[PDB]
Amino acid sequence: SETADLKSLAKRIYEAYLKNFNMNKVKARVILSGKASNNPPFVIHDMETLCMAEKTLVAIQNKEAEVRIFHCCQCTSVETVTELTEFAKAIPGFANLDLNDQVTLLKYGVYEAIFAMLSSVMNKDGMLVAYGNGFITREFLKSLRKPFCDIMEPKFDFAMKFNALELDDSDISLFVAAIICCGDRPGLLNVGHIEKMQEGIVHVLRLHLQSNHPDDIFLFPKLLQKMADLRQLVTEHAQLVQIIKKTESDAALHPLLQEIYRDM
Amino acid sequence: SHMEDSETADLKSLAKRIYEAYLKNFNMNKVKARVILSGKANNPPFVIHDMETLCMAEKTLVVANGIQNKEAEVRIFHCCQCTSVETVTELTEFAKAIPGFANLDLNDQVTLLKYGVYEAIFAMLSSVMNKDGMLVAYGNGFITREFLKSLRKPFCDIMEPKFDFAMKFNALELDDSDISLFVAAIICCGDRPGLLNVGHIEKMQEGIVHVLRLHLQSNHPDDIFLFPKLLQKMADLRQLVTEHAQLVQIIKKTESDAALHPLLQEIYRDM
Ligand SMILES: COC(=O)N(CC(=O)O)Cc1cccc(OCc2nc(-c3ccc(Cl)cc3)oc2C)c1
Ligand SMILES: COC(=O)N(CC(=O)O)Cc1cccc(OCc2nc(-c3ccc(Cl)cc3)oc2C)c1
Numbered sequence: 001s002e003t004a005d006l007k008s009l010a011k012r013i014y015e016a017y018l019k020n021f022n023m024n025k026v027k028a029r030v031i032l033s034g035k036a037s038n039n040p041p042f043v044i045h046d047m048e049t050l051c052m053a054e055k056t057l058v059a060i061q062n063k064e065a066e067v068r069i070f071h072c073c074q075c076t077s078v079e080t081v082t083e084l085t086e087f088a089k090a091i092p093g094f095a096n097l098d099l100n101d102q103v104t105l106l107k108y109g110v111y112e113a114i115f116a117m118l119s120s121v122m123n124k125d126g127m128l129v130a131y132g133n134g135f136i137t138r139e140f141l142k143s144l145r146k147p148f149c150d151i152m153e154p155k156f157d158f159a160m161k162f163n164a165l166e167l168d169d170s171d172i173s174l175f176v177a178a179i180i181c182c183g184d185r186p187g188l189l190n191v192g193h194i195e196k197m198q199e200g201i202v203h204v205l206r207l208h209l210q211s212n213h214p215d216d217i218f219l220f221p222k223l224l225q226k227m228a229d230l231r232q233l234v235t236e237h238a239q240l241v242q243i244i245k246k247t248e249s250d251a252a253l254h255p256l257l258q259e260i261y262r263d264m
Numbered sequence: 265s266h267m268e269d270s271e272t273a274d275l276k277s278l279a280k281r282i283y284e285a286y287l288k289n290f291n292m293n294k295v296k297a298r299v300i301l302s303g304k305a306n307n308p309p310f311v312i313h314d315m316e317t318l319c320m321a322e323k324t325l326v327v328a329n330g331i332q333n334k335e336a337e338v339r340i341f342h343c344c345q346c347t348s349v350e351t352v353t354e355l356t357e358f359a360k361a362i363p364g365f366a367n368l369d370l371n372d373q374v375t376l377l378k379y380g381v382y383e384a385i386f387a388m389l390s391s392v393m394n395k396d397g398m399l400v401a402y403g404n405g406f407i408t409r410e411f412l413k414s415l416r417k418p419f420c421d422i423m424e425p426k427f428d429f430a431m432k433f434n435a436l437e438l439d440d441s442d443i444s445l446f447v448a449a450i451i452c453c454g455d456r457p458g459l460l461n462v463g464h465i466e467k468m469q470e471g472i473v474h475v476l477r478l479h480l481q482s483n484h485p486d487d488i489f490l491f492p493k494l495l496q497k498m499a500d501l502r503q504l505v506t507e508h509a510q511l512v513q514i515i516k517k518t519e520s521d522a523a524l525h526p527l528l529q530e531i532y533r534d535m
Binding site: 142 | 395396410413414428431432
């Protein structure tokens, strides 16, 4: 045993994952079963059901129904950004880094990470919203007017492909941690150590997937591709967001998310 | 007041003569298709969702004589054509059965058909589709939309746009009585280029359009504006077909193992 060091680290990240994230694949897959355990979610398929949801599920009414979704989306992503930061701090090594390195990894990582975890609450028909109490159809999102329907579709594409890997929360913890702890991110200060720290989380991820998915020994290689597809997905997302802000008159970009995009 | 007059018994006759012609000449219809999809029909469809079930399908559904060893995308491509060629035939027989259609100039019979057939195929294709996939092989098969997306460019760009159409179209909750009339109005279009007796064909559409109007008002008095909604769909199909005409040519012009059926070639020549 020298890897007894590593098997440890894997639980430390995954505990941090279970702690700092209210929404997880195992919880999300149980909800959408039909083995609902209590009440099932509430489905949104159009207006009527949307505005019944905007009643019972949120805290708006003045505005068009497209921007309601657009704004609601940011409420969720900001919460998640917060959860992601608390999770980043609970990664061994992350705290040790320059303050301005802790901010940069987080800047370029959070979205790649949001969309990877977003797959957990998506299937082909829709996604789990409002803390898991709601569910909005993919169809409904596509049957919204341009350019707002071009928003969510590409993420569904990603998720279907992603959930085909049939990863679990233990895999997703390490995977997400490999996304945050990335040495590519422009403007890093201690580039060499972030890399040594990456190559370390990458190692445990590789071996974990080999214990958990012996049935596909090439899963890790495939996650490195998904990591690639995520960076493009985010670049793509950056622009669809820019555009909607610089055209659509009632489009309100939260100042935190604005900053994240600043100099994308 | 008044019982039913024969100026409008002529109309329920038309909507009646057309509907039967539709049942006579189309092997697949919306009533059949939904029964097959609910699994309330009795060895149900066979799901295709990967390479294995694709290949193990062609074995027990179509074995390929002159295709056995091609790629996987080009199989679907060719497979698709067998179905549409079989549909054009069914569409032509159905067109011969529309009152007035046989009476038209022989060239006019084939021009209305040239421009109508794809508009009608995709309109009717909606019957065999849901959000997940579509019925294939005379009903006995089923292929995931998912799987059709999970092919490469530009092959996976073919079938998606028709799923967009169909989901919106099926939301109109139309039935075979409506579709029969709608298809007839598609074929009988006074709009199509190079027509030889444009005035009579105009008049002919107008009659079929008028029957469709009142039939929709009867069978769907809950959406009194179903008819206009359907006029929009005609438009949506013209462009769906147009876009489709160009992705086919691309796939012909580029993809070196993409054969276009010679009947379909002729059809496409000039759109
Ligand atoms: C611009 O919006 C986005 O596409 N995103 C937010 C961002 O850029 O920060 C991406 C994104 C990230 C995470 C989740 C997300 O969508 C969640 C989400 N939540 C709703 C919604 C609408 C009404 C009610 Cl009552 C409840 C929920 O819709 C959606 C798509 C969307
Ligand atoms: C070029 O092919 C096409 O996209 N089309 C044909 C054409 O243009 O004439 C459009 C089209 C028209 C009508 C139906 C259609 O889809 C039927 C269809 N049938 C299959 C298939 C594949 C393997 C097996 Cl074993 C069985 C069936 O796939 C598809 C899409 C597709």
